[PDB]
Design a protein around this ligand. Structure first.
Ligand SMILES: [Mn+2]
Length: 129
């Protein structure tokens, strides 16, 4: 995947968390990044079009990560959009629920740039990108 201009949507209800992920993406060479504060805000941005990757926190108010993921997967236009779920604590049940709903990957924060880069690269490879 050589498109460093792949457009990311970073979804988290904590501004600091969104800024962390944006800064790690910047470090890796991904500068085309937008932010959303919950699942509905995210869906509104996604319908504007152009997005290539979603990094979403699991626990958000109003519409959480799992529901956002399900909505994306049920959307004809965005059904195959890569979605990487972020959580503070890995739980078997959550990982399985996310997988059943079509998550592309799942990562525990806090994470480093190297860790994020590995998650991304493994998803690109899994998806044939
Ligand atoms: Mn949260």
């Amino acid at each position: 995947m050589a498109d460093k201009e792949l457009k990311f949507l970073v979804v988290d209800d904590f501004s600091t968390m969104r800024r962390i992920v944006r800064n790690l993406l910047k470090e890796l060479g991904f500068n085309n990044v937008e932010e959303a504060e919950d699942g509905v805000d995210a869906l509104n941005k996604l319908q504007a079009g152009g997005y290539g990757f979603v990094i979403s926190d699991w626990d958000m108010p109003n519409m959480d990560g799992l529901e956002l993921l399900k909505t994306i997967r049920a959307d004809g236009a965005m059904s195959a959009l890569p979605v990487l779920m972020v959580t503070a604590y890995a739980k078997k049940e959550n990982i399985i629920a996310a997988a059943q709903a079509g998550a592309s990957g799942y990562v525990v924060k806090p994470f480093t740039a190297a860790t994020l880069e590995e998650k991304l690269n493994k998803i690109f490879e899994k998806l044939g990108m």
